[PDB]
Structure formats: structure tokens, C-alpha cells
Design a protein around this ligand. Structure first.
Ligand SMILES: [Zn+2]
Lengths: 277, 89, 272, 77, 277
């Protein structure tokens, strides 16, 4: 059965080309004694040495190209562009370089926003959050991409499963298993990564006691794992998202249901960490 | 075991443990010193960690008589607050 | 006349009764002055006064239509103040460059409708009404995100079409979008992509100065919304206005059954 | 009828807190203090019966997807 | 399959006797005309039915014939059934206009008024099975005990109305009116209960009323309406809170007075549900 076809990504392709051209072309201000050439090609080439499979690019540089108009697609609509920024970036590496997990972490955001200033408009968007870490946790693997199959019984399908559920593989299979059947869990074909959760709390100097400062979850995915320390202020890359959770009896409710229930809360993500603060 | 660590006793094993002003010590500690002198080991049951650490320390103490320089003609045990059994050690 | 269900507050009637409410001191016993202050700042959130419509005529009845039926009346009031902004601009001709400033969202924030006595006195007979309350705040809960416009996906092809939530429910079409394609396979709901709106929760003791003595005061959890969220901290003894709500809770556990005794919370449209 | 080899020091010498996904399925040395240990509860291991399917090894550690007659137990801790 | 065995007590003609009890009266015009109309006039909700007068009526209906079946024993013998039976009779004799009722005036009365208006109109148009009698009430029937100064008639053993100990309470008093006494304990704070809660449909509308029976009920979706049903395909329906009829609900436990406790044991509380006025 042919899949006809795929659609449409529109702007996503424009941002793919813009971001590719941006990471390619300068991206250079300084002249004479530089700070010139490239710096991002030289960034990837310097990265070829340790091959730690992450990159660092400044947001301030990214705003300079289109006068911030490029940075806007990468701001509010950002999570829409995560699969595009990755594969796209690989389309660069395949050209200039010779086992691929790539963690893109932007940094140096124009303005730092407190946890109190966190809004539901800021979802899917880079936001810098400053505050002290509380309750770090031990590093464990994420499923990332998995082969869970067969799944009735020989299929051996390896795809997707990137989103956090993790249920389920084996749906719309093999061709053709028609599972159902077992999931089935196979952990040898599934690459893993990172991660450690930290519960971020607002600094005590800002909060007007009587306050009772409101902590919130930030999970560190990426190679910035372990970079965080308890009792200290840290600046993160926003990617606010949301995570589903079981609330106490009186919420008071009642949030909607998905019918042929859902309970959500803000869980902040950070793909980059720094000790600033 | 605090968000494992020994007290002075465990830390100082084979060495010399030096304590002063017993009288100002909260009972919670007093039982610890007593146990240490008694069986030469500190047992810890919390949280999940369960052991007996070994403190062989010599205790040297400074104590302050109740009230004045010499509180009474009355015997030492009467002179100071510390109970007689801990003193016998 | 366009009757609307049981609320029976008529569209294309009360809109005009409010539209000629404009330009009044009057009376009293501001109004357009403060609105003319509002148009520059872009702060929106028109706080109103309440009482205005009383004893003033016309709209002696509108006060009773809002008090007895605040749900619709607030929405209609917002539409009308928006179109009275639109009619304010055409008077001065080209304003603020140009039409975008009207597009921005506005709302009415009514307050001080009568003097209500406590939470305790309240009858179960009035569940859509504007209700004063007072008491300290024991805690301000972390922000819960609320559905506004829902997003959907499928294995085919994949297509990006999505549908708004409207009422407090979510129904996705079984099959399917664009086209067609089909097949019957269940919809894939992206969790993060869809839009959200701020809903806090605020616990309130009932007037600790006014008590049965010695019985400990009763909790009232008022859920707020939008701008009002995270606009307060704790222990504020002053006052709050908003629409009363009784909504069913899911009990034991699972089972998809209703406990049949609806819990009660306040929508708290305004705070002052 | 089985001898599993002990394999002395293998640096590495990763300590504890330094560990990643890269260590999966691959033998790695670790070091540190013991904390109170569970008592010794025989694990299922090999399965055997008089019939009555055949011997089924399970597992480390799943067990999906019971009979027993003479099964060779091995202590777990 | 579920056998049946006749009993001398029959509710059919007893209802008739209730109807003769109501609106036909002398001893106290009659009290049941005025007491009912003042409720119909909507300045009054609670209907306090005294069992004393029920006692007075039988004398006129016996000796003084013509002789009839007894209520005062038959009521307190059951006393739940009469709330759904003795009280529905009020619907048949109630003054229709009654005076100056209007519509709004009252909140939520306009809702149902427009319900019956649009229903009458649309039905009379369609013909060119009705809203339940429990939704339209706005009043509560409450019996009271006969102590009594006139209980000395004497019907003797007829009295409970025996201000009994909580200890005296037995499993043989279930489904029989009983006075009890003690100190109020814990006196839980009032919350709204529910009765009908007619959810609203979408496409073709109508209404359906789900009975609130026992403690809880299961909510339904589907479609009950034949119009939305099967074409096309099943209309969606939601509960409307304005339309529902709410009855106040407050529960409280009552421990014994402790003088009524023997040399031994312990104070035993008894849970008490409250409704309406
Ligand atoms: Zn319908």
C-alpha cells in the first residue's frame, strides 16, 4: 500500500533552508582580526574531534540575519520545527562529514523570564528560566527511537516511537503483521539518551515573603545532563511543552476528555544548561 | 544519613574523640555516646541502610560542675548533673 | 429578536440598550472618559463599575439580566464594548494604524453586584450568578494549562488539520482528513502542539472574622482564568467577584461514574 | 555443570555518578559502599518437569511470556 | 422467578384517601387549600405535613363513617414511599393560575417555561411522554412526629415519635420514621445535590431527563433522541446546569447524649442527611 503522499510543511521547509543557509553562511561580524570564517562550519569541524554529537549556536546571531523575522518562526512555533532542524542539520553534516544522535541547543536569549512570568502563550517556545535547583535525580535512559516488534511474530519493525507515551509500537503494521499481538519490547535495537530531572525553584531574593515560592519541573534531556548543581541558579533553553499527570481529588475540575480523562501540567524542558547566576 | 555520615565517634576511630560540656548535650546525643562507650560500635538503622559502624575512640571530656566551683561537700556524682552510670564508664 | 435558549437575554436588543448607555455621568446617584484612557494603553480589561445600570434607565433590566445570567451577558457586553471601540475610532477617523488595535482582545470585569452574604448562606438554587466572596488565601496552586484550540494527527498522510474545543469536551472525527484517506485508524492527538490558556486555583477560607465559633471555616476554591492568574499571592482578606459553578466529579475511580454530588467552585471573573 | 567466570579488574573504572547510555549491554566496573542487602531468595532460573513442553530458561529478568518438577534454582540477591 | 405474596395494605385506594385528605377538610376555609396556594404563590417552599391531622381525619372517616384503611400506622410503617406518593397528589389538586405568577420574576423558571412553550408549539406543529413531575416542584414535603397531646385519642402503640436512645435503634427500624436525640457532631457543610439534570443535545435538540436515584448515577451519552439517532449519525449531548433542579444537601453525624450510655461501651454516632428547607 503506497502512502500518497505527505503534507505540506510549507513554512517548515522555508525555515529548513533558512536555518541551513544560516548555519552554513556567516554569521560573521568581526573583520581583520577575527572571529571570521566561519564560525559554524569551523564549529562542526571542531566538533569532529570529540564527536560528542551536540552543537552550540547563538540566538543573537540567528536574529541578525532576517532582522529577527527568521527567529520568530523559531520562537513561538518552535516545537513544530524540531524534526526539521535535526534532519536538516544532518543534511548538512552528510555533505561535510562522515550512530547519529544530534542535540541542538540554542542559547543567549535576549531576555530572561522568571517562573512566575511563565504563561500558556510561551508554550512551544524558547524561554530562559533562572532559579535554584532542588531535588536532582539519577540519570536513566529515554526510549528515544525504538524497535518494538515483532509483534506477530517476525516483523522486526524499527521506527518512530519518539513521542512520550511510550505506547505503542506495532500499530499500522508490519506490512503486514496486523498486530495488535504483543507490543513487543526490544531494547537492543533502541538507542537511548540522557536524562536527569531537576526541580527548579525561584531565587529567594526576588520572592516577596510572605510568598511560598512555586517550584516547577525542568527535565534535562541532552548532553547538558549532569551540568546542574543543587543550591545554585541556572539558565536553561525553554521548550516549555506540557506533561500529563494525576491531580488530587478536587482540582477543582473539570478539564475535557478525549472521546471516540486528560490532566496536564507545565513541565519545562531544557536542552542547554549554564552555571550563570 | 542525611540529604552516610558518622558522628565524631565513627570519624575518629582508633584516634581520640574530644568532647566538652556534656551537661549541655541533648539526650539524643547522650544515648549515642553511651552506646559508643558500651559496645564500641555505633549501629545505624535508617533509612534503608542498616549497619554497625565501629568507633573504638578514647573519649576525653570537659564537664562543668553544677553551679559553683565546688558545688558541695557532697559526692562528685551529686556535685555534677551527669548520671552515675554514664560516669562509671 | 433571536431568542437564546433559557437565558433568554436577546441578541440585537441588549446590545443596543448597552450601546446607548454610553456618555453618562449622569445620574450618579467616566463613562467614556476612562474608556478614552483605555484606548491608548492597550491594557484592555475594562473594569466597569457596577453599579451603573441601576438605577439608570434604560437598562434597569440589564442589571438583573447580568446578575441572574452573567454567563452570556459578559460575552455580549464584550462584543458591544468592542464594537463601541470600533465606533469610537471611526469618529476620529484613522487611529493607531490601523485596524489591528481593534482586533486585540477585550473583556468586561464586572464587580460589586449587590452585597452577598458569605459563601455559607448560599442556596443551591442559584448556580449561575455573580457572587461576592471574602477571605484569606491559604495557597496559590501551580498553573494548569487549559485547552483552547485542539490539534490532531493521523498515520495518514500525515495531515495537519485541527479543530477547536468550544464546550468543555473534545470530539475528534473518526475518519478523516485530506484526502481521502481515511483509513479508520484512531486519531493521533499531539499533546504539546495545541494551544493553552492559564487556569490557576485559589483556596479561600470563609471570612475567619465571621464564624460559627468554634467550627473551623469552610474552603472555597475559586479557579480564576487568563490575566487574573498569578496576579495574587496569599492571605488577602479583601474581596472577589465571579460566577458560581457546580461541576460533577469523577468517583471510584475509573468506572466512568459520577459521584452525583457536584462540587462547587467560583469562576471569579474579577478581583478587587 | 556450570561455571561462570569472574573476570577481574576491567578499567574503565567509571565510578558511579558517571554513567551514560553508552554503557548499556557492555561490561563496566563500579565501586562504592554497600547498603543493607535483601535476604537470599532463590530465583527460578531453569525449568524442568516429568512431562507431563520441555525446559524453558527464564530469565534475566522478565519471565514473559509455571510448572516445576525438578528445577535448578540459583540464589538471587 | 421472584415470587410475589399479597399484603392487606394497598396503595391504590390509599392514594384516593390521600386525595380525600387533601382539599377536603374542615377542622382547621380548609388549611390544605391555603397552605398549598401560598406555596403555589411562590413565597413558600417547605410543606409541613403534620401526622396529627391525619389522625384527626380518620375519626371523621370511621365512627362517624364511612370506615377506611389506616394511614398513621401505614405511613410511619414505610414513610419513604409516601414522599413519592402522598406528595405527588398535591400536583392534582393544586391551583393552576395561581395568581400573578408571571415568568421573570424568577430565575430558571423562565427556562422551563420556554421549554414547555417551545415543546407545546413544536408538538402542536408536528401533530398538524412529558417532563417528569419531580422536576416541576419548587417545594418540599416534610412529615412531623406526633408526640402528642392529642395522641391520647388513644391510638397508643401508634407513636414513634418515641424519643428513643441511639442504642435503642435497631435494624428493625429501617424504613420506619423514628425520632432520635443527641448532640450534633461534625455538622458537614452544605453542598448541592442533584435531581434532573436534563442534558441538552445538539443537532435536533429535544431533552432527556436522567433520574437521580440512590446515591449516584452513571452519566450517558449516545443519543436518546430518535432524530439525531441513526441519521446522521448519533447526536452529541451535554448536561445543562441552568436547567437542572438542585436540592440543598447537608450531612451531619449525631453522637449519643452520653447519659443514655450504659455503665459500659462507647458513644455511637448516627449519620443524618438533610434536604431542602
Ligand atoms: Zn438531538
Amino acid at each position: 500500500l503506497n502512502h500518497v503522499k505527505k503534507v505540506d510543511d510549507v513554512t517548515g521547509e522555508k525555515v529548513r533552508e533558512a536555518f541551513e543557509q544560516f548555519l552554513e553562511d556567516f554569521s560573521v561580524q568581526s573583520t581583520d582580526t577575527g572571529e571570521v570564517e566561519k564560525v559554524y562550519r569551523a564549529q562542526i569541524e571542531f566538533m569532529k574531534i570529540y564527536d560528542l554529537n551536540t552543537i552550540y549556536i547563538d540566538y543573537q546571531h540567528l536574529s541578525m540575519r532576517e532582522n529577527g523575522a527568521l527567529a520568530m518562526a523559531i520562537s513561538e512555533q518552535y516545537y513544530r520545527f524540531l524534526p526539521f532542524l535535526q534532519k536538516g542539520l544532518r543534511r548538512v553534516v552528510r555533505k561535510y562529514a562522515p550512530e547519529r544522535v544530534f542535540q541542538i541547543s540554542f542559547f543567549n536569549l535576549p531576555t530572561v523570564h522568571r517562573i512566575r512570568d511563565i504563561r500558556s502563550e510561551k508554550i512551544g517556545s524558547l524561554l530562559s528560566i533562572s532559579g535554584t535547583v532542588t531535588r536532582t535525580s539519577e540519570v536513566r535512559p529515554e526510549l528515544y527511537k525504538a524497535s518494538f516488534t515483532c509483534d506477530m511474530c517476525r516483523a522486526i519493525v524499527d521506527n518512530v516511537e519518539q513521542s512520550f507515551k511510550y505506547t505503542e509500537p506495532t500499530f499500522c503494521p508490519n506490512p503486514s503483521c496486523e498486530n495488535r499481538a504483543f507490543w513487543t519490547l526490544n531494547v537492543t535495537r533502541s538507542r537511548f539518551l540522557d536524562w536527569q530531572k531537576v526541580r527548579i525553584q525561584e531565587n529567594a531574593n526576588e520572592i516577596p515573603t510572605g510568598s511560598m515560592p512555586r517550584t516547577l519541573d525542568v527535565i534535562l534531556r541532552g548532553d547538558s545532563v549532569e551540568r546542574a548543581k543543587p543550591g545554585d541558579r541556572c539558565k536553561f533553553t525553554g521548550v516549555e511543552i506540557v506533561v500529563p499527570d494525576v491531580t488530587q481529588l478536587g482540582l477543582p475540575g473539570v478539564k475535557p476528555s478525549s472521546t471516540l480523562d486528560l490532566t496536564y501540567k507545565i513541565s519545562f524542558l531544557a536542552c542547554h544548561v549554564i552555571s550563570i547566576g | 544519613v542525611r540529604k552516610l555520615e558518622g558522628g565524631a565517634l565513627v570519624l575518629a576511630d582508633k584516634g581520640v574523640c574530644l568532647i566538652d560540656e556534656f551537661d549541655k548535650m541533648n539526650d539524643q546525643d547522650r544515648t549515642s555516646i553511651h552506646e559508643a562507650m558500651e559496645q564500641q560500635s555505633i549501629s545505624i538503622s535508617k533509612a534503608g541502610i542498616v549497619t554497625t559502624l565501629q568507633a573504638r575512640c578514647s573519649i576525653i571530656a570537659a564537664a562543668n560542675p553544677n553551679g559553683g566551683r565546688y558545688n558541695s561537700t557532697l559526692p562528685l556524682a551529686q556535685n555534677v548533673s551527669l548520671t552515675e552510670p554514664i560516669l562509671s564508664r | 429578536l433571536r431568542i437564546i435558549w433559557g437565558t433568554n437575554v436577546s441578541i440585537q436588543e441588549c446590545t443596543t440598550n448597552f450601546r446607548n448607555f454610553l456618555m453618562s455621568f449622569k445620574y450618579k446617584f467616566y463613562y467614556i472618559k476612562q474608556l478614552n484612557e483605555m484606548r491608548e494603553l492597550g491594557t484592555s480589561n475594562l473594569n466597569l463599575d457596577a453599579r451603573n445600570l441601576l438605577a439608570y434607565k434604560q437598562t434597569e433590566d440589564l442589571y438583573h439580566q447580568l446578575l441572574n445570567y452573567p454567563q452570556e451577558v459578559i460575552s455580549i457586553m464584550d462584543q458591544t464594548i468592542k464594537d463601541c471601540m470600533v465606533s469610537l475610532i471611526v469618529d476620529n477617523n484613522l487611529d493607531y494604524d490601523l485596524d489591528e488595535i481593534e482586533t486585540k482582545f477585550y473583556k468586561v470585569r464586572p464587580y460589586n453586584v449587590g452585597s452577598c452574604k458569605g459563601m455559607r448562606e448560599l442556596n443551591p438554587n442559584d448556580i449561575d450568578k455573580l457572587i461576592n466572596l471574602k477571605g484569606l488565601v491559604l495557597r496559590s496552586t501551580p498553573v494548569i494549562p487549559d485547552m483552547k484550540v485542539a490539534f490532531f494527527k493521523c498515520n495518514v498522510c500525515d495531515h495537519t488539520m485541527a479543530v477547536e474545543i468550544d464546550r468543555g469536551v473534545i470530539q475528534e472525527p473518526a475518519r478523516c482528513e485530506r484526502i481521502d484517506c481515511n483509513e479508520p485508524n484512531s486519531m493521533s492527538l499531539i499533546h504539546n502542539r495545541c494551544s493553552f490558556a492559564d487556569k490557576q486555583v485559589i483556596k479561600l477560607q470563609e471570612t475567619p472574622d465571621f464564624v460559627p465559633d468554634g467550627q473551623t471555616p469552610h474552603s472555597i476554591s475559586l479557579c480564576v482564568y487568563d490575566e487574573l492568574v498569578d496576579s495574587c499571592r496569599a492571605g488577602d482578606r479583601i474581596e472577589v467577584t465571579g460566577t458560581f459553578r457546580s461541576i460533577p466529579i469523577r468517583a471510584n475511580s475509573r468506572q466512568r461514574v459520577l459521584k452525583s454530588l457536584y462540587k462547587t467552585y467560583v469562576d471569579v471573573v474579577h478581583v478587587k | 555443570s556450570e561455571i561462570h567466570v569472574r573476570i577481574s579488574d576491567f578499567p574503565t573504572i567509571y565510578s558511579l555518578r558517571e554513567l551514560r547510555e553508552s554503557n548499556l549491554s557492555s561490561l563496566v566496573r563500579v565501586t562504592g559502599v554497600v547498603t543493607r542487602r535483601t535476604g537470599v531468595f532463590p530465583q527460578l532460573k531453569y525449568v524442568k518437569f516429568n512431562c507431563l513442553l520441555g525446559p524453558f530458561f527464564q530469565d534475566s529478568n522478565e519471565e514473559i511470556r509455571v510448572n516445576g518438577e525438578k528445577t535448578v534454582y540459583r540464589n538471587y540477591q | 422467578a421472584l415470587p410475589s405474596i399479597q399484603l392487606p395494605v394497598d396503595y391504590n385506594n390509599l392514594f384516593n384517601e390521600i386525595t380525600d385528605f387533601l382539599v377536603t377538610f374542615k377542622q382547621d376555609g380548609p388549611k390544605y387549600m391555603a397552605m398549598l396556594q401560598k406555596v403555589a404563590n411562590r413565597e413558600l417552599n417547605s410543606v409541613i405535613i403534620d401526622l396529627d391531622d391525619i389522625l384527626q381525619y380518620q375519626n371523621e372517616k370511621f365512627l362517624q363513617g364511612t370506615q377506611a384503611d389506616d394511614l398513621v400506622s401505614a405511613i410511619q410503617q414505610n414513610a419513604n414511599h409516601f414522599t413519592e406518593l402522598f406528595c405527588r397528589a398535591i400536583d392534582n389538586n393544586m391551583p393552576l393560575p395561581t395568581k400573578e405568577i408571571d415568568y421573570k420574576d424568577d430565575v430558571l423558571d423562565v427556562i422551563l417555561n420556554q421549554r414547555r412553550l417551545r415543546n407545546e408549539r413544536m408538538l402542536s406543529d408536528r401533530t398538524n411522554e412529558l417532563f417528569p413531575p419531580n422536576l416541576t416542584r419548587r417545594y418540599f414535603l416534610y412529615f412531623k412526629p406526633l408526640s402528642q397531646n392529642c395522641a391520647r385519642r388513644y391510638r397508643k402503640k401508634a407513636i414513634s415519635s418515641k424519643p428513643l436512645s441511639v442504642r435503642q435503634i435497631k435494624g428493625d427500624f429501617l424504613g420506619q420514621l423514628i425520632t432520635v436525640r443527641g448532640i450534633i457532631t461534625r455538622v458537614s457543610d452544605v453542598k448541592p445535590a442533584v435531581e434532573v439534570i436534563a442534558y441538552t443535545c445538539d443537532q435536533c435538540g429535544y431533552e432527556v431527563f436522567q433520574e437521580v436515584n440512590s446515591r449516584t448515577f452513571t452519566p450517558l451519552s449516545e443519543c436518546t433522541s430518535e432524530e439525531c439517532s441513526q441519521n446522521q449519525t448519533k447526536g452529541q449531548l451535554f448536561m445543562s446546569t441552568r436547567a437542572s433542579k438542585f436540592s440543598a444537601f447537608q450531612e451531619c453525624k449525631i453522637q449519643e447524649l452520653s447519659q443514655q450510655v450504659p455503665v459500659g461501651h462507647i458513644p455511637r454516632s448516627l449519620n443524618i442527611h438533610v434536604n431542602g428547607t
